Amino acid sequence: GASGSERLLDELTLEGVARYMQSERCRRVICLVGAGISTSAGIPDFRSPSTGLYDNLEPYPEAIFEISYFKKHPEPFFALAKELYPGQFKPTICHYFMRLLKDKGLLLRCYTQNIDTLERIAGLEQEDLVEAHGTFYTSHCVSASCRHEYPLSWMKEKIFSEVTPKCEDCQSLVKPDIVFFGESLPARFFSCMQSDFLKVDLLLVMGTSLQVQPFASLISKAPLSTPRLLINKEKAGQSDPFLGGMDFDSKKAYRDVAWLGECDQGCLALAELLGWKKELEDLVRREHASIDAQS
Numbered sequence: 431g432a433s434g435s436e437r438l439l440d441e442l443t444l445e446g447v448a449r450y451m452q453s454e455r456c457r458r459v460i461c462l463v464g465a466g467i468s469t470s471a472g473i474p475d476f477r478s479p480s481t482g483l484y485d486n487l488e489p490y491p492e493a494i495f496e497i498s499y500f501k502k503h504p505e506p507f508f509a510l511a512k513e514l515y516p517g518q519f520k521p522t523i524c525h526y527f528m529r530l531l532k533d534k535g536l537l538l539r540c541y542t543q544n545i546d547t548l549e550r551i552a553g554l555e556q557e558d559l560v561e562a563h564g565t566f567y568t569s570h571c572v573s574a575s576c577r578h579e580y581p582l583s584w585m586k587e588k589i590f591s592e593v594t595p596k597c598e599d600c601q602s603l604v605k606p607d608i609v610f611f612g613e614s615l616p617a618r619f620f621s622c623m624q625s626d627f628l629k630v631d632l633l634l635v636m637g638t639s640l641q642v643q644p645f646a647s648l649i650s651k652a653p654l655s656t657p658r659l660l661i662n663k664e665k666a667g668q669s670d671p672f673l674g675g676m677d678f679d680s681k682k683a684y685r686d687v688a689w690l691g692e693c694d695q696g697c698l699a700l701a702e703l704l705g706w707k708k709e710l711e712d713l714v715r716r717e718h719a720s721i722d723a724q725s
């Protein structure tokens with residue numbers, strides 16, 4: 431139930447969440463993540479004004495996002511892809527915390543808004559993942575009668591060689607599997623959401639301001655009793671008083687917890703409460719060393 435009934439969290443704090451997680455009542459965790467979990471990996475949020483995307487872009491700046499424009503004028507997109515292509519893909523502490531959840535048998539699903547493929551590199555598998563905004567990991571020929579699939583290694587070569595990618599079978603445009611403005615979200619998002627939120631014991635919301643729909647409205651799909659922990663630089667998910675959502679601070683707040691700071695630091699703090707800190711340290715250091723050593 432709502433604030434009217436006996437709550438699952440013994441107190442609304444990171445400490446309360448940790449005790450809940452290690453009790454028998456918490457089995458399945460859904461993560462909802464956004465650009466805020468990749469910034470410490472050296473990938474800025476291209477939606478944040480501070481990142482300065484539109485300065486790099488100089489008809490209108492938004493055309494870069496539109497599927498209609500892309501299809502008749504693909505060259506800008508692929509030039510930008512080369513410019514913004516990460517120099518390294520090295521997932522963050524936050525990403526590997528989710529790998530730990532998987533290892534500990536607690537991870538039901540990770541829903542991500544990010545296109546950077548860092549969840550995959552960190553060891554989440556396809557079954558574990560719903561890429562709500564799509565991804566660069568795979569690309570497809572845009573011809574409905576072909577739809578030939580291409581791996582990132584193929585797309586990357588085309589991107590860096592500055593050759594507009596064309597399908598080897600039919601010579602139609604090949605488009606990364608990211609959702610362009612004008613495209614619907616993947617069917618997978620909807621079918622998975624319908625099943626997963628019947629099963630969820632805890633919602634871990636990290637590095638997202640929950641301003642972009644439908645992804646944002648996911649938090650309202652949780653059962654009334656399900657605790658929701660936000661790890662983010664600023665509070666988010668509260669109902670717009672002008673236009674329910676998160677209630678962290680009111681006299682009725684029973685399930686929602688905000689931990690404010692960098693996602694890496696919040697995940698580190700939670701891992702330490704859980705007795706996972708050495709495990710996380712060991713995992714991150716190993717995987718980071720491996721990635722740094724790529725030859």
Ligand SMILES: Cc1cc(C)nc(SCC(=O)Nc2ccc(Sc3ccccc3)cc2)n1
Nearest residue numbers: 476494495511514515545546566608609610
């Ligand atoms: C090109 C690339 C490849 C991989 C695997 N990851 C990344 S993450 C860095 C990044 O922000 N890239 C990036 C690439 C393209 C665009 S433009 C666009 C974005 C979404 C939808 C349509 C168009 C905006 C940002 N970027």
Ligand SMILES: [Zn+2]
Nearest residue numbers: 571576597600
């Ligand atoms: Zn084709």
